[PDB]
Ligand binder design. Structure first.
Ligand SMILES: [Mg+2]
Ligand SMILES: [Mg+2]
Ligand SMILES: [Mg+2]
Ligand SMILES: [Mg+2]
Ligand SMILES: [Mg+2]
Ligand SMILES: [Mg+2]
Ligand SMILES: [Mg+2]
Ligand SMILES: [Mg+2]
Ligand SMILES: [Mg+2]
Ligand SMILES: [Mg+2]
Ligand SMILES: [Mg+2]
Ligand SMILES: [Mg+2]
Ligand SMILES: [Mg+2]
Ligand SMILES: [Mg+2]
Ligand SMILES: [Mg+2]
Ligand SMILES: [Mg+2]
Ligand SMILES: [Mg+2]
Ligand SMILES: [Mg+2]
Ligand SMILES: [Mg+2]
Ligand SMILES: [Mg+2]
Ligand SMILES: [Mg+2]
Ligand SMILES: [Mg+2]
Ligand SMILES: [Mg+2]
Ligand SMILES: [Mg+2]
Ligand SMILES: [Mg+2]
Ligand SMILES: [Mg+2]
Ligand SMILES: [Mg+2]
Ligand SMILES: [Mg+2]
Ligand SMILES: [Mg+2]
Ligand SMILES: [Mg+2]
Ligand SMILES: [Mg+2]
Ligand SMILES: [Mg+2]
Ligand SMILES: [Mg+2]
Ligand SMILES: [Mg+2]
Ligand SMILES: [Mg+2]
Ligand SMILES: [Mg+2]
Ligand SMILES: [Mg+2]
Ligand SMILES: [Mg+2]
Ligand SMILES: [Mg+2]
Ligand SMILES: [Mg+2]
Ligand SMILES: [Mg+2]
Ligand SMILES: [Mg+2]
Ligand SMILES: [Mg+2]
Ligand SMILES: [Mg+2]
Ligand SMILES: [Mg+2]
Ligand SMILES: [Mg+2]
Ligand SMILES: [Mg+2]
Ligand SMILES: [Mg+2]
Ligand SMILES: [Mg+2]
Ligand SMILES: [Mg+2]
Ligand SMILES: [Mg+2]
Ligand SMILES: [Mg+2]
Ligand SMILES: [Mg+2]
Ligand SMILES: [Mg+2]
Ligand SMILES: [Mg+2]
Ligand SMILES: [Mg+2]
Lengths: 62, 171, 212
RNA sequence: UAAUGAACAAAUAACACUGAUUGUAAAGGUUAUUGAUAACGAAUAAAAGUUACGCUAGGGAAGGGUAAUAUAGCGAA
RNA sequence: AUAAUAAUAAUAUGGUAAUAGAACAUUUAAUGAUAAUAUAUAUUAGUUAUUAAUUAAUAUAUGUAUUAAUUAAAUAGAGAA
RNA sequence: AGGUAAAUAAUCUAAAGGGAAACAGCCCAGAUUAAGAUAUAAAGUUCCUAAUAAAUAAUAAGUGAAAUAAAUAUUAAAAU
RNA sequence: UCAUCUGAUUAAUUGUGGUUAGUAGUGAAAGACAAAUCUGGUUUGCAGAUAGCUGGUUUUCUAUGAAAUAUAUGUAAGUA
RNA sequence: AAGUAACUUAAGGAUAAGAAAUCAACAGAGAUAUUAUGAGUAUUGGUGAGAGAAAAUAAUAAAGGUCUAAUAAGUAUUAUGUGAAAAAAAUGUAAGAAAAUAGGAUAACAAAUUCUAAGACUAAAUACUAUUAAUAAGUAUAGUAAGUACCGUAAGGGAAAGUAUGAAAAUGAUUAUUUUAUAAGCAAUCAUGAAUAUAUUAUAUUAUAUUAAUGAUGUACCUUUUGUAUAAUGGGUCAGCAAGUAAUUAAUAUUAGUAAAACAAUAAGUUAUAAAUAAAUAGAAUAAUAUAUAUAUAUAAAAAAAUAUAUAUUU
RNA sequence: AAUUUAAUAUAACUAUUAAUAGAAGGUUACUAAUAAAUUAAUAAUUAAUUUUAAAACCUAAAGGUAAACCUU
């Protein structure tokens, strides 16, 4: 039987009929940049259709 | 070339070979199985090839004959202290030719084991099958060209393969 | 067979005019032609399971509750499928027995208020908890709600007590709350906690401990 | 309009979210922040040569085109 | 308010990689008459818009079909290694 | 350079059929199966090879006639 | 094989037995020999090692029908 | 990969395990051994390739609970080097207790629970092999010979081969019909004379079949390529054999059963029934359709972004 | 008084299920063999339960070897 890919499990979560994720690029080198601009690098986004199929295969039981 | 086992060789192995015991089991919902069983029984009844043999638990408006029985069995078989043959098979053949069904598939569904019937129908094993109510199948019923079923066995099968209803009070 | 219940599996490598001939769909050459490569391998670039950060943690102490809205209760009532004798309480056992809450109940049931505007049953209710709107609607309809604490074994005993009676001759005693979260929740009055609503001995023991 | 670097693993602070018998802890999480992978979408914390003794699987990722060069002629002088 | 066949007007019908429908030959399992005035195989000549079956003649074997048809399955189709 | 690098068509790739003598890429045209009466595309009509009769000038060098070779030199044509 | 040439009392040539070898022997040293050939022999097993490479992949009919570009990649014969 | 292959050693019809210094969580269970759910969840990883439980509920199983020990000391524990990918009892070196007024179990401490190491026996459900019976959408290339012939010094490798029939092809000789000694290329198609053969409606001025007069057209087939008649790959010919299959899973589509329920029906358990959040004790109309409501960010509360729920009958 | 179907042999293997149980080869030659008993069955055959006779040489370990040899 297939096994959940734990890396994807830790970096992705199931929401509705798709998956959520965190942002990339706000863990160092933030000083000198605009806070009102870095605001866009805080929070979550949704999976993209280009890789929805990959995610479905990587997390069979999600 | 490599080893001598290659499938491309005369004494080589077989590509993508199976390994017994091969698994061919399949599963089907119980409700569908019950519906199919009811359908087979209904088909036999509609074709007029389902005979019901029973009594002693329902009111009879015509008395049973002295020679006959109310059960799907043939008594007086083990009494073989006569000639090379005894009464059981003789009565079975007489039934066979009286009802004009000799090389026809026959099915006998019973409640409990009927050793007399089994012994008497042993000579015609090629065309007559005897089964208890527990072990019958749709293939047996549909294969039989004449199906005999005891009344209690029919009661049991009907109860088992019954649609379930709860409450269901409506105007 | 019934129409639309069977097809023909596509047969590979059995002639040119079959449409699936020598290449049999593989294409021309490559690793995929005569080899196996992961479906989610993308040639080296940081994968979708590496670029993003690991977010969140799994709460092992979680207690998911099966949700029960008021519209279902009212619907059962109007369907005459809610068989309660007069002066009888609708608890999780009866929800399971009647069919209000179906399937396995791991931890408990929470009553939510979606059909609150049409709920008019003056019956009494029990559950692990309920929403504030559910409490308000239940009381407005002339009913009564209290939230009770069950462990896994205690809830099993509550749902299927005859199992314990048959196997062991006795139903286990319901366990007293032991955490801080449970005691706090069931001591709250706005949650209709059973400890406070029935003034039971546990809170008194805690008070005698503090006052010493 | 350039002035830049992913995720893992560490570290500091705040938050009051979870605290694996309970209580506190430990640890994790959320928010903010730090250090550069310049082959700059970054294999590992960590790695150069030689074979004319060489081996396997493959691809070829004098003729043909050109006339810069060479040779030869022509015009003009 | 379908299905089959036929009729009229209009549009469309090249195809590698690839996608999607449909069908035939072989073998096996379930149901399954008929029979040497038949069945099976082979050759020659005809028929059906024909990878297949059929009709006639001839030859061999056999009192004879896992037969026609519907399903279920494949060691199910070879000028390319 | 029948080179190399990209930018618009088109075709080959994966396109049979007619013309380019022969011809992946050029000119025309896209084969479901036949039939063969009619109108044709590109290309052609002395014979090989399906199909033509004319007008007005020039060429005399087989120049040329389905792959135009340059500077220059000679000999010839009319405008005032 | 024939002819020719070299040592021919020695660091000689041979017979019969024996010991040393597969990370491993012997070697007047040539990567030489270890059962017709070794920069490390054979047999069996792991084992259907692995191969982004090469070659094969079998009947018919019908309808639609591409690409050889961008980005990324220890990536340019692969893959997304 | 894997404590696998291999080598070595030692038992028995079986071996091994086994009646808690076990689980669990304040309520409780009560020995081993396999199987299903739990569950690919907790846990774990150059947090990469990947690995991965236990409680608890069921199934198989036997009478399954017993005393044999003066009740266990260089032992528990500690430090250190190793040690089943998560989970741990053994293990080299060296220090080293206590007596049920005690000891083991959790990173640590307190409280509470639970069990008593350093002494032991134990059917059955299981593994392998050999007979007997039953069923084969299994085998006559998995149908009895032979580990023989033969190959190697050796370890070792390792054949063909039942009976009858047989107008199967490749291949050879001969005969018959027809064409062929002034004509040049994938050997074929079309056009068209002529000879021959058969024909129980050839009535014939007939039909069909075989055959290089003669004319036109025609650059073998696959593979791999931008592109091959290519002097690029493969093929002396024919017959037989030769290649997308199995489980264990996830997603999607069609039909069929049932349907706010479905599958099982011993208990469980898996989907669906509520959206959301990293998570927490939060969770959908104040007398109506987003302008209301739920969650997340922010809270006096709203507004603002994103999803989601409400217009006789619940999807 | 025949003749065909379907099972069955001392005379195949493979897979599963269910029972029962934990059983000589080679060499060639002074060739390697048997005998009986019991009760119940119209001098006795049921078979099946007990007794027995012989059986060379070799297959590491009475000693040695070049296996079927040799020496005690
Ligand atoms: Mg952060
Ligand atoms: Mg901006
Ligand atoms: Mg194709
Ligand atoms: Mg390619
Ligand atoms: Mg290929
Ligand atoms: Mg490909
Ligand atoms: Mg890289
Ligand atoms: Mg708090
Ligand atoms: Mg704790
Ligand atoms: Mg912290
Ligand atoms: Mg790099
Ligand atoms: Mg780069
Ligand atoms: Mg970039
Ligand atoms: Mg490096
Ligand atoms: Mg040299
Ligand atoms: Mg087409
Ligand atoms: Mg067309
Ligand atoms: Mg085949
Ligand atoms: Mg063949
Ligand atoms: Mg062919
Ligand atoms: Mg071949
Ligand atoms: Mg070019
Ligand atoms: Mg085109
Ligand atoms: Mg191509
Ligand atoms: Mg063309
Ligand atoms: Mg021309
Ligand atoms: Mg031409
Ligand atoms: Mg000329
Ligand atoms: Mg001397
Ligand atoms: Mg001598
Ligand atoms: Mg050298
Ligand atoms: Mg050799
Ligand atoms: Mg050498
Ligand atoms: Mg191989
Ligand atoms: Mg391996
Ligand atoms: Mg098309
Ligand atoms: Mg293109
Ligand atoms: Mg590329
Ligand atoms: Mg034992
Ligand atoms: Mg493992
Ligand atoms: Mg003790
Ligand atoms: Mg003790
Ligand atoms: Mg230690
Ligand atoms: Mg390991
Ligand atoms: Mg003890
Ligand atoms: Mg030899
Ligand atoms: Mg002639
Ligand atoms: Mg010639
Ligand atoms: Mg090339
Ligand atoms: Mg060509
Ligand atoms: Mg040639
Ligand atoms: Mg060739
Ligand atoms: Mg060749
Ligand atoms: Mg709000
Ligand atoms: Mg001896
Ligand atoms: Mg001697």
């Amino acid at each position: 039987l297939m096994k959940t890919h734990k890396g994807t499990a830790k970096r992705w979560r199931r929401t509705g009929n798709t998956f959520k994720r965190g942002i990339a690029g706000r863990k160092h080198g933030n000083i000198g940049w605009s806070h009102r601009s870095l605001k866009a690098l805080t929070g979550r986004k949704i999976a993209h259709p280009a890789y929805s199929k990959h995610l479905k295969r990587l997390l069979p039981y999600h | 070339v490599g080893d001598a086992n290659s499938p491309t060789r005369h004494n080589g192995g077989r590509a993508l070979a199976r390994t017994a015991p091969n698994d061919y089991t399949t599963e089907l919902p119980s409700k569908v199985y019950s519906m199919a069983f009811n359908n087979a029984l209904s088909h036999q009844y509609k074709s007029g090839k389902l005979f019901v043999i029973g009594g002693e638990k329902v009111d009879l408006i015509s008395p049973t004959p002295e020679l006959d029985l109310n059960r799907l069995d043939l008594v007086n078989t083990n009494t073989v202290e006569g000639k090379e043959i005894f009464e059981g098979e003789v009565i079975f053949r007489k039934f066979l030719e009286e009802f004009q069904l000799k090389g026809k598939r026959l099915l006998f569904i019973t409640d409990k084991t009927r050793e007399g019937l089994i012994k008497s129908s042993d000579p015609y094993k090629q065309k007559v099958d005897v089964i208890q109510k527990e072990l019958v199948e749709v293939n047996d019923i549909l294969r039989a060209q004449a199906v005999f079923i005891e009344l209690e066995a029919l009661e049991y099968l009907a109860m088992a393969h019954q649609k379930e209803i709860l409450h269901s009070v409506s105007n | 067979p019934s129409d639309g219940s069977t097809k023909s599996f596509k047969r590979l490598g059995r002639g040119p005019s079959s449409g699936l001939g020598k290449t049999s769909g593989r294409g021309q050459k490559g690793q995929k032609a005569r080899g196996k490569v992961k479906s989610w391998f993308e040639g080296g670039q940081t994968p979708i399971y590496k670029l993003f950060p690991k977010i969140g943690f799994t709460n092992v102490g979680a207690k998911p509750l099966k949700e029960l809205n008021l519209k279902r209760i009212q619907w059962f009532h109007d369907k005459n499928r809610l068989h309660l004798q007069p002066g009888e309480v609708l608890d999780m056992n009866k929800m399971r027995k009647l069919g209000l809450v179906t399937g396995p109940i791991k931890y408990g049931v929470k009553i939510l208020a979606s059909g609150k505007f049409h709920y008019n049953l003056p019956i009494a209710l029990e559950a692990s908890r309920a929403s504030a709107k559910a409490i308000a609607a239940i009381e407005k309809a002339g009913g009564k709600f209290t939230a009770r604490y069950y462990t896994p074994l205690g809830l099993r005993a509550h749902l299927n007590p005859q199992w314990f009676l048959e196997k062991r001759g006795r139903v286990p005693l319901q366990a007293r709350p032991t955490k801080r979260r449970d005691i706090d929740f069931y001591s709250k009055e706005e949650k209709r906690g059973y400890l406070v609503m029935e003034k039971d001995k546990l809170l008194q023991d805690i008070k005698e401990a503090q006052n010493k």
